[PDB]
Each structure stands twice: as structure tokens, then as C-alpha cells.
Amino acid sequence: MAMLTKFESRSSRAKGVAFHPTQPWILTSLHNGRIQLWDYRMGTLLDRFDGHDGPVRGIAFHPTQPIFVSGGDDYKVNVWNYKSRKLLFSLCGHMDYVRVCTFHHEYPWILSCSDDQTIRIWNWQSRNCIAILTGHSHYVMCAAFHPSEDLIVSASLDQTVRVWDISGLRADAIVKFVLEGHDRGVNWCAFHPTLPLILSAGDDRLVKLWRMTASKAWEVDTCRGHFNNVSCCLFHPHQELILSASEDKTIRVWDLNRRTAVQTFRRANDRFWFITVHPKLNLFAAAHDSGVMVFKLE
């Protein structure tokens, strides 16, 4: 597989990346506490937002409104309007670092998760917390909404992946599955957009694929390779492929049905922390120690 690199930012370490739905922009949230807005067509730094102390691990655009959300090691979830260029409000509530934050695709909700061992759901119009999901016994490193069902998947350093039934779209939330298999902490999880599958990535250097029925869930297979912690993973939305990124300085592509290696991409001296895909285009971004790369695959 070929990587067609479209843009590379050079910066201090980047942690999060978010693709705008219609403009050729990405937000990149940095370890230094700054949030950068880049035009990746021209390669221009359009703006920089300063509203956190310490790393900014979570970053996401709203799908239709001129809003983005950021989440930081200062424990805050911040909501911004990028047209007016203003920080609108802070959702404080988390009691330790925020690891992820994202908007729901339809409801006026923000999802966040934290080292405080909770996943929280906020209504961004009323600006209050509407749900707190407890159960993990260590940091929650990742949480994500299912694209079509009332489910959330989360990953924790407690070595489990959890699937939560959220119900309460209309207690609010119950744990449906607890997935054990990783022998070390789990850093990331993802839903397939259409199949009942989940991917996870761990400090065991493994990416695991799981499947769900209405009543059961279990481990399908393992992507073996990576020689350090696997930071992030996702399903290719248009091909039967798995993508993963790791502190071993590689992005790897694997076949979804076989878990065989397809391609490895390396950087000389940059650990990878995060990968994402554009919500409409076949466009990917990866965050690493020296900035962010935006690329297409074959």
C-alpha cells in the first residue's frame, strides 16, 4: 500500500487531530497546551487557540455547527466557536486528565473520558452533565459513540474494553459487555461503521478484533507486529483494512478478515499517538512527536 502525503505540520508533539467536515482544515491539539488550526491544502496555520494548561489530548469538530471541543490535562472540557473565535464555556467536572472528547453525530451531546475512571456525557446546549458511566477501575483512555446504535465503547488501563448500552437516549447507561483478553492496559477502541466489530489497541503491543452478537461478545483475532505500545487503531471506512499507530514509530495496515500485514510506514524518530479518518473523504491524519501528517492510502 502507498501513502500519498498531502500535508505535514512540523511542531512539538501533537496529541489529537480533527478533520473539519467541509473545509480543508484540521485542528491539532498539542502537548504544549496549544490548539492549532491548519489549512492542509495550502499548508497554513490559520489560527491558534490558547485555553488549556498542559497537554490537550482531546479535540473534535461538531458535524454541522461552528463549534469544536477540546479536553485537557487541566481536567477541563472546553467548547469553542471557531467562527467568532471564542471559548464559550468550560465543562469542569472531571477529576483527573481528560483523554478524549467528541460530539455526538445527532444529539446535542459531548462525550468525554478521563483518568478519573469515568466516561461523561454532556449536553452542550444546556451545558450540564447528563450521564456519568462508572465501572472501569483505572484510567479510561478512550470512549466512542456507535454510529447507528445507542452504544458506547470504552478502553481502560484496567485491561478491559467495555460496551455500554445508552438506553437513556430515552438507568441512563448500563454495561453490556466486558471484554477481557489484553494482558496489559488498553489505550484505544473503535467501532466498525456497519459490522458488529470492535478493535482495540494495547500496551501489550497488540491490536485485537472483537465481535458482538445481541447477547455475547468475544475476541476474533490479534494483529501481531508492533514492537511497542499501540496508541490508536481504526477501521478503514471504505476497504476491508485495519489501521494502527504505535510508539514503535510506525503506522501499520492489516487485512480485516485475516489480520495479515499489509503495509508498514515508519518515521525515523517520532512515536505515533493518534490516527483519524475524514468523515467524508478517504483522507487520514496521524499525530506524532514532530507534528501531524495528512495522507491518502493508495
Binding site: 508533539r13 483518568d115 484510567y139 483512555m141 512515536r271 499517538w273
Partner: peptide, 6 residues
């Protein structure tokens, strides 16, 4: 005492 700081 904390982990995953990078």
C-alpha cells in the same frame, strides 16, 4: 504516581 503522561 501518574502514568501515560507523554
Amino acid at each position: 504516581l501518574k502514568t501515560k503522561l507523554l
